[PDB]
Amino acid sequence: EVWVVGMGIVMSLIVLAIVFGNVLVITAIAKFERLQTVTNYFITSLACADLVMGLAVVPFGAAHILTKTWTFGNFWCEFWTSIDVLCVTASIETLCVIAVDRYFAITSPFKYQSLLTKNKARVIILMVWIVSGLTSFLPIQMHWYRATHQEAINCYAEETCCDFFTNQAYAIASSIVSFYVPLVIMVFVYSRVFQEAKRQLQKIDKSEHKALKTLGIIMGTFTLCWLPFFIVNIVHVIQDNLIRKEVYILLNWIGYVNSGFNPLIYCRSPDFRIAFQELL
Ligand SMILES: CN[C@@H]1CCc2c(ccc(O)c2O)[C@H]1O
């Protein structure tokens, strides 16, 4: 009753769902001119990142786990690691960009038009992707993330193994850039938005519960998917024998699933429902 035929089906289902949802979202945005909006360009960038992550990094990792060997060379292992880091950080930063856009829309409605236009959004997205690619491709391809202990060199020399060993400085300065700062920004933004919504409800009740569900769906999903992995990412370098490799791999694959839940969270507007109904 091997797991090769058991977990493989689950991995295939994950890949199919991730590809299909994001392809549908991108086609719906592109085909119909009624959905082209400044707030929809960030969703397009997020969907592109999720599509690349579901097409490139996931199948090769699944093959590596099931076959238990890395047939390809060292160059493709490095390329795969770089693409993985790039696609994770781009998505996690686009989420914070969306949150800040919503904050600026809600808080200052008179000047919202001037702050965000078609000119600024393109530059913002390009800057996000450039910063994403500056921390992923450059340090990995210039060999600055490597370690010093003997097992790291033994893994590096052999061309039939692809395992992730990292240095302390790279791990800390990568987690800080990729996860914690956007988390703080999103927390502050959504706290302000919730306060404004509560004030408006109080005003209406003075003149004459529904926001907690949306805030939870937006935030708890991201926190539960990505917070556990980065804690052990920080811990495992400091403590040599406090984290096993299997737990690290499992917590890493928990995070990949988060790319499939984005269409359900950010793309269930009635206009999007009409677009999906017309397409299929
Ligand atoms: C092999 N998986 C990698 C390992 C380290 C790492 C990831 C994602 C974002 C980062 O900032 C990282 O440092 C993971 O996707």
End-to-end Cα, the chain, rounded Å = 38
Q: Is the CB of 221 under 6 A from ligand 1?
A: no
Ligand 1 centroid distance, CA of 85 (Å): 5
Q: Is the dihedral of CA 273, 274, 275, 278 positive or negative?
A: positive
Measure the CA–CA gap between 130 and 132, rounded to whole angstroms. Answer: 5
DSSP string, the chain: --SHHHHHHHHHHHHHHHHHHHHHHHHHHHH-GGG--HHHHHHHHHHHHHHHIIIIIHHHHHHHHHHSS--S-HHHHHHHHHHHHHHHHHHHHHHHHHHHHHHHHHH-SSSHHHH--HHHHHHHHHHHHHHHHHHHHHHHHTT-S---SHHHHHHHH-SS-------HHHHHHHHIIIIIHHHHHHHHHHHHHHHHHHHHHHHHHHH--TTHHHHHHHHHHHHHHHHHHHHHHHHHHHSTTSS-HHHHHHHHHHHHGGGTSHHHHHS--HHHHHHHHHH-
How deeply is 101 buried, as exposed, middle or buried, from its count of CB atoms within 10 A (0-12, 13-18, 19+)?
A: buried
Closest C-alpha residue for ligand 1 atom 8: 85
Q: Single out the residue of 280, 278, 213 nearest to residue 32, CA to CA.
A: 278
Q: Whose CA is nearest to atom 6 of ligand 1?
A: 85
Atom of ligand 1 nearest to the CA of 177: 11
Q: Say yes or no: CB of residue 132 within 6 Å of ligand 1.
A: no
The amino acid that residue 209 corresponds to is H
Determination approach: cryo-EM
> Cβ–Cβ contacts within 10 Å for residue 220, how many?
10
**CA 122, 127, 131: angle at the middle one, nearest 5?**
155
Give, for ligand 1, the residue of 168, 233, 245, 253 to mutate: max count of ligand atoms closer than 8 Å to Cβ: 233
Q: Domains of the chain by range and CATH?
A: 4-279 (1.20.1070.10)
Residue 223 exposed, middle or buried by CB count within 10 Å (0-12, 13-18, 19+) = middle
Contact predicate 259/18, CB 8 Å: yes
Please check if 174 is assigned to a binding site. yes
How many angstroms does the Cα of residue 117 sit away from the middle of ligand 1? 33
